[PDB]
């Protein structure tokens, strides 16, 4: 205990010095809070990430099944970066983006830079040129699986796409650090053998259950596990709602995280906050908070205050 803690503090410090902050952590540690982060669209996921959003100047990976919600998470990251006066790019080898959807989340599609590259090499090269500029706050790559190598597209051995990512990330990681630009790589469940080690954050995104709006499907309850996190204790998880053509119910995560923290009391079906009532049932409480932005923002302030940030 007494002479033990000294040697361990020493061991942690030289590790932290030799390989960087976050190279070792106790899981119960408080997160080291940066100046700015890119919020994810859900306070719950912002909390699970420790630092209140995605880190800047880092490689992020977001993976999961088709239509699992990972792209949605990415688009919110894009919206928030923009909302803070940032510029966004979207490298697209998938050709699946829906801008109407993007718009409804908050994305400023008109000023969103987009590139539909001919090859994997070109995709990553273009992304690099954008990053070296210094003008970018965020760049999304959709997707890892779709980054097909020139040689393969030209019909010419196997394992080359992996070699491609490894090379690309080596160069790119130093650029992102200098820039303060975050790179989100979307990935399916595939060339990310390199991405797994370069990424400062990895998120596993999945559908838990289909949200009911009477008889029709209004959305999906989404679950994200932060399986890797160099910026705060890893393995934390969060749930939030993604609603059809609307996105992540910000207000849903406020309530959920509200009752979690005891800032929102729950006497029966009635959600209460600070003496007043928000609504009977989740949807009324949710609806109340979109109609009343002021209180929703007040609840959001209180959660951030009561936690790291």
What are the structural domains, with CATH classification, of the chain?
25-248 (3.40.50.300), 249-309 (3.30.250.10)
Q: Which two tokens mark 256? A: 């959920």
Can you give the resolution of this entry in Å? 2.8
Residues sharing a CB contact under 8 Å with residue 49, sequence separation 6 or more, in sequence order: 37, 40, 201, 226, 229, 231, 232, 236
Phi/psi at 91 (5° precision) = -90, 120
Residues sharing a CB contact under 8 Å with residue 53, sequence separation 6 or more, in sequence order: 37, 38, 39, 40, 46, 80
- Provide the phi-psi class of 249: left if phi over 0, else alpha when psi is between -120 and 50, else beta: beta
Give CA–CA dist 91/151, Å, rounded. 20
Sign of CA dihedral 86, 92, 97, 99: positive
Annotated binding residue 66: yes
Nearest CA-CA partner of 167 in 159, 156, 157, 177 = 159
Instruction: Using alpha carbons only, give the angle 253, 256, 262 rounded to the nearest 5 degrees.
Output: 130
Give CA–CA dist 139/10, Å, rounded. 38
The end-to-end CA distance of the chain, in Å, is: 32
Annotated binding residue 30: no
Annotated binding residue 64: yes
Annotated binding residue 69: yes
Which experiment gave this structure?
A: X-ray
Location of structure tokens 């009324």 = 284
286, 110 Cβ separation under 8 angstroms: no
Give CA–CA dist 169/277, Å, rounded. 51
Annotated binding residue 65: yes
Query: How distant, in Å, are the alpha carbons of 102, 205, 208, 219, 220 from that of 216?
Result: 22, 23, 17, 9, 12
Give CA–CA dist 42/100, Å, rounded. 20
274, 282 Cβ separation under 8 angstroms: no
């Amino acid at each position: 205990t007494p002479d033990r803690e000294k040697a361990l503090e020493l061991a942690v410090a030289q590790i932290e010095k030799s390989y960087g902050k976050g190279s070792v952590m106790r899981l119960g540690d408080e997160a080291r809070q940066p100046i700015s982060v890119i919020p994810t669209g859900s306070i719950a996921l912002d909390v699970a990430l420790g630092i209140g959003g995605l880190p800047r100047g880092r490689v992020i990976e977001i993976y999961g099944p088709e239509s699992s919600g990972k792209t949605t998470v990415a688009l919110h990251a894009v919206a928030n970066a923009q909302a803070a006066g940032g510029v966004a790019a979207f490298i697209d080898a998938e050709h699946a983006l829906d801008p109407d959807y993007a718009k409804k989340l908050g994305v400023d599609t008109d000023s969103l830079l987009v590139s539909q590259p001919d090859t994997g090499e070109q995709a990553l090269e273009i992304a690099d040129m954008l990053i070296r500029s210094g003008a970018l706050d965020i760049v999304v790559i959709d997707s890892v699986a779709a980054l097909v190598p020139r040689a393969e597209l030209e019909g010419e051995h196997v394992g080359l796409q992996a070699r491609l990512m490894s090379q690309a990330l080596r160069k790119m990681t130093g650029a992102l650090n200098n820039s303060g630009t975050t790179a989100i790589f979307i990935n399916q469940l595939t060339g990310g053998k390199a991405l797994k080690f370069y990424a400062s954050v990895r998120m596993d995104v999945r559908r838990v259950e289909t949200l009911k709006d009477g008889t029709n499907a209004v959305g999906n309850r989404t679950r994200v596990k932060v399986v890797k996190n160099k910026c705060s204790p890893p393995f934390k998880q969060a749930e939030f709602d993604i609603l059809y053509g609307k996105g992540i119910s910000r207000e849903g995560s406020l309530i959920d995280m509200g009752v979690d923290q005891g800032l929102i009391r729950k006497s029966g079906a009635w959600f209460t906050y600070e003496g007043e009532q928000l609504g009977q049932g989740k949807e009324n409480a949710r609806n109340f908070l979109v109609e009343n932005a002021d209180v929703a923002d007040e609840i959001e302030k209180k959660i951030k205050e009561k936690l790291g940030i």
